[PDB]
Amino acid sequence: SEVPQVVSLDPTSIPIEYNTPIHDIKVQVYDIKGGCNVEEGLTIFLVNNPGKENGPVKISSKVNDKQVSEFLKDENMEKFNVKLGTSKHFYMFNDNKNSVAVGYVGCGSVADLSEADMKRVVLSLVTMLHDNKLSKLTVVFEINVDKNLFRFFLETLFYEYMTDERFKSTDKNVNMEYIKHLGVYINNADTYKEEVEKARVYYFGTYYASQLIAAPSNYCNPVSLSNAAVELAQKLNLEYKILGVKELEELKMGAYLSVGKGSMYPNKFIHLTYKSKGDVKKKIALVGKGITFDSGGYNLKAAPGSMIDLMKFDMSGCAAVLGCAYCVGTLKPENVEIHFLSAVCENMVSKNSYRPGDIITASNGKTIEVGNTDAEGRLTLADALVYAEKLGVDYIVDIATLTGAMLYSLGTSYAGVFGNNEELINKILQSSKTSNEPVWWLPIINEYRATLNSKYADINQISSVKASSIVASLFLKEFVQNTAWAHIDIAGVSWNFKARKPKGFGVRLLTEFVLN
């Protein structure tokens, strides 16, 4: 629990914001058939024009204001088009001779907005929210969205609107001012109301993960991350257990302990459990990779474009699992028992570091020949997967920033999923659809298994077969003997390079998985 320091100026905890301005926003949903009141703040219409490549803007909704309705007549609106992402601001006086602000966001010509399309729409909305000191936002849905896409709209809105200033000091934005009210006008309003607070939970689960990932390695270390996990568990009334080095040695986790040998921070194994109130029909282990910093070890990340300054992300999997723990602990699903696992450590260069060539013994007895110290994720997961299977669960799902090869296979939008079981894989893909976090199924090619045959050990850590994501999956598979297991590689999608911030990818995916 006590974080070691080199100097007294070294931080000893991760700064975490639990009460965000988003949580202070009163959200109301009204039915669009009842007409819209356009009074205070900014009122935005989400409008499209089917079969028309940049068609004219037409406001269909009834507006309970003669002056605003007059401004919004088609003859007035025809100068504007519905091109996806396009937005405009309107200034006018309402029936009470009060100044009001009105506008729209273009939703293109396609009647079915993709996950990318809605995100593009949301981003345009946030630009209107930025650099403007509004007290209220009102969104009028003149497009067709189902419950899932509606929830996605809110989640994405909350997440992008929120700004992380935990590490700002002399450069805090002096103009930041969050809205206090959110009004939503939509068709079939009663069906969508339940999605509001679920979206708020999914938001924070994601933002919490984001906070952990964005936190630098001097703030976010194996000890401070594990302390934060306990703190979260206490708040959610979850059972929790943090395994220290002596306990890990007792469990003979030689692979996990080897990676952390060169670190000044002791290894900390996070084990959280949520158990439903009643009959448990499904037991699930969620495993997250928890490398608080990946220097690469003695296989140092020194090659051009290895982005070592980014390697604080290497605990993104752990964050996804912890963010899911928040959502599950808050929404409290029934008939499920969930274990949240993460073998947390740091991969550093030291006199005490494990070397390339070292042979290490996993907790299941298998000896492993280390061919590359920068492939440390699969080593820590190996011991974690063995621990997971001993819990006696039905499904083991691990999520990890495992291989850079994902950038060349799926890129920055789609995570890849591997597994030994098609049913579990199908559930993950189903969860991908409903959570709107895109995942693609990649194969575990058994023909490559022979490249992991070590001359001296039971198995090689790496091949020496480019195909890194597949080989890594073959490695991990060796540590699950008779349990349905799935592996999600998020090395490519975890970090948003365009926005220079984490995505908190996987939180919504895993929560949808546990709930459904």
Residues within the interface to ligand 4U6 (CB under 6 A): 294, 305-307, 372, 374-377, 401-405, 407, 462, 468, 491-492
Q: Alpha-carbon distance 377 to 259, whole Å?
A: 9
For residue 302, the minimal CB distance to ligand 4U6 (Å) is 12
192 vs 293 by CB, closer to ligand 4U6: 293
d(CA 227, CA 244): 12
What Cα–Cα distance (Å) separates residue 75 from each residue in 71, 419, 438, 482? 9, 57, 41, 68
Build a one-symbol-per-residue string for 309-328: x at contacts with Zn ion by CB under 5 A, - elsewhere.
Answer: -----x--------------
CB atoms < 10 A from the CB of 414, how many? Answer: 18
CB 172 within 8 A of CB 127: no
Alpha helices (H) along 332-441: 377-390, 406-409, 422-435
- Given a second copy, Zn ion, ligand 4U6, none, residue 282, with its beta carbon under 5 to 8 Å by kind, binds none
Measured from the CB of residue 406, what is the shortest distance to a second copy in angstroms?
9
Q: Which is nearer to ligand 4U6, 118 or 462 (CB)?
A: 462
* Angle CA 438–415–513, to nearest 5: 60
Binding partner of residue 65 among ligand 4U6, a second copy, Zn ion, none, CB cut-off 5 to 8 Å per kind = none
Q: Is 374 annotated as a binding residue?
A: yes
What is the CB neighbour count within 10 angstroms for residue 438? 18
Q: Does residue 294 belong to the site contacting Zn ion (CB under 5 A)?
A: yes
Cross-strand partners of 452: none
Residue 279 known to bind ligand:
no
Question: Choosing from 119, 301, 433, 449, which is the catalytic residue?
Answer: 301
Q: Which does 249 bind (CB under 5 to 8 A by kind): Zn ion, a second copy, ligand 4U6, none?
A: a second copy
**What is the smallest separation between the CB atom of 511 and a second copy, expressed in angstroms?**
23
Tokens of 347: 């991969």
Closer Cβ to a second copy, 198 or 477, answer by number? 477
Q: In the complex with a second copy, which residue's Cβ is closer, 373 or 431?
A: 373
**What's the min distance (Å) between Cβ of 127 and ligand 4U6?**
27
Closer to a second copy by Cβ: residue 89 or 275: 89
Within 8 A by CB and 6+ apart from 456, the residues are 359, 369
Please pick, from the candidates 195, 358, 374, 383, the single residue that binds Zn ion as defined by CB under 5 A: 374
Q: Tell the smallest beta-carbon distance from residue 105 to a second copy (Å).
A: 12
The single-letter DSSP state of residue 365 is S
Q: How far does CA 508 lie from the centroid of its chain?
A: 7
Q: What ranges make up the beta strands (E) of 228-332?
A: 239-243, 268-275, 282-288, 290-294
By the 8 A CB rule, do 72 and 57 touch?
A: no
Please report how close the Cβ of residue 466 comes to a second copy at its closest, in angstroms. Answer: 4
Cβ distance to a second copy smaller for residue 132 or 187: 132
Q: What is the bridge-based pairing of β-strands 336-347 and 439-441?
A: unpaired
Q: How far is the CB of 405 from ligand 4U6 (least distance, A)?
A: 6
- The structure tokens listed for 286 are 């969620």
301 is an active site residue: yes
The 3-class SS string of 213-233 reads HHCCCCCCCHHHHHHHHHHHH
Instruction: Measure the CA–CA gap between 71 and 352, rounded to whole angstroms.
Output: 72
- Residue 50, contacted partner among a second copy, ligand 4U6, Zn ion, none, CB below 5-8 A by kind: none
358 binds Zn ion (CB under 5 A): no
- How many CA within 13 A on the CB side of residue 452? 23
Residues 6 or more apart whose CB falls under 8 angstroms from that of 427 comprise 395, 513, 516
> Binding of Zn ion at residue 377 (CB under 5 A)?
yes
Cβ at position 380, least distance to Zn ion in Å: 9
Partner in contact with 190, chosen from Zn ion, a second copy, ligand 4U6, none, beta carbon below 5 to 8 Å by kind: none
Please tell me whether 337 is known to bind a ligand.
no
CA atoms within 13 A on the CB side of 396: 27
One-letter amino acid at 475 equals: F
Nearer to a second copy, 9 or 190 (CB): 9
Cα 3 from Cα 12, distance rounded (Å)? 5
166 binds, among ligand 4U6, a second copy, Zn ion, none (CB under 5 to 8 A by kind): a second copy
Category of 15 on φ-ψ map: left (φ > 0), alpha (ψ -120 to 50) or beta: beta
Q: Is 312 a known active-site residue? A: no
Catalytic residue among 378, 427, 477, 508: 378
Binder of residue 457, out of ligand 4U6, Zn ion, a second copy, none (CB less than 5 to 8 A by kind):
a second copy
- For position 346 contacting Zn ion by CB under 5 A, the verdict is no
Q: Which residues contribute to the annotated binding site?
A: 289, 294, 314, 374, 376
Q: Which residues contribute to the annotated binding site for Zn(2+)?
A: 289, 294, 314, 374, 376
Give the residue numbers annotated as catalytic, written as ranges. 301, 378
